[PDB]
Amino acid sequence: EVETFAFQAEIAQLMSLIINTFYSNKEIFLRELISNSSDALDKIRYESLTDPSKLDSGKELHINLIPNKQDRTLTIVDTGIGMTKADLINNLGTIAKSGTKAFMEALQAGADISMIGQFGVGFYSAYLVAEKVTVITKHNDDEQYAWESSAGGSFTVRTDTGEPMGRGTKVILHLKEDQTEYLEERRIKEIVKKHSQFIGYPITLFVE
Numbered sequence: 001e002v003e004t005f006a007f008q009a010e011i012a013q014l015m016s017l018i019i020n021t022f023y024s025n026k027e028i029f030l031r032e033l034i035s036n037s038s039d040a041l042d043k044i045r046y047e048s049l050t051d052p053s054k055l056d057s058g059k060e061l062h063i064n065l066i067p068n069k070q071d072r073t074l075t076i077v078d079t080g081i082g083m084t085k086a087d088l089i090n091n092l093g094t095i096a097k098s099g100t101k102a103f104m105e106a107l108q109a110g111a112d113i114s115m116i117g118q119f120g121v122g123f124y125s126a127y128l129v130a131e132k133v134t135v136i137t138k139h140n141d142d143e144q145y146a147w148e149s150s151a152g153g154s155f156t157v158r159t160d161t162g163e164p165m166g167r168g169t170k171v172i173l174h175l176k177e178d179q180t181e182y183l184e185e186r187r188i189k190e191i192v193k194k195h196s197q198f199i200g201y202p203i204t205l206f207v208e
């Protein structure tokens with residue numbers, strides 16, 4: 001069943017900072033998560049220009065936004081390259097130790113939280129609006145895994161059973177009680193239009 005890991009001290013810190021720092025422009029979380037999905041989809045793309053059997057786990061390269069009012073969740077699904085178990089543990093494939101260093105320094109020197117994606121740690125912006133984040137992932141080589149964290153210094157990794165996905169990553173944001181605006185069609189559309197309107201892959205906003 002479930003393995004528990006300690007975040008590296010630098011990530012544990014960034015996350016406390018993201019969670020605790022007063023910052024009203026929370027919406028940038030969606031641009032950062034769509035920008036990582038797009039990066040993951042560029043990667044599966046690049047790979048398949050030399051090995052087309054890579055697209056056998058699925059040819060459609062896209063991004064879905066799925067809000068669920070009853071579960072209070074907003075899910076970003078992509079059919080990107082996915083992460084193997086080691087990717088997920090090595091904090092979701094990021095240089096997060098060195099990025100938090102560069103980021104926390106960039107903040108000292110006049111940056112604001114909205115620039116987080118320049119240091120390749122934009123994922124953690126999910127903790128502006130979510131109390132809990134589950135990342136379900138499937139890379140061609142490996143199993144389907146679930147990663148989960150409610151911050152506080154640890155995360156879990158397990159094998160995910162059932163809901164097979166073929167290839168990619170889902171980020172499920174369990175929203176905080178007072179960030180439910182991010183479940184509204186109108187607000188999601190406004191934010192994609194403000195910050196993500198020239199992404200290179202179709203983004204579909206699901207209706208409830």
Ligand SMILES: CSc1nc(-c2ccc(C)cc2C)c2c(C#N)c[nH]c2n1
Pocket residue numbers: 032033036037038040078080081082083091092093094121123124135168169171
């Ligand atoms: C390289 S495969 C991959 N990785 C990520 C991702 C990247 C970095 C981090 C810290 C976390 C995730 C889930 C996403 C992601 C996010 N966030 C959305 N799709 C993704 N696909």
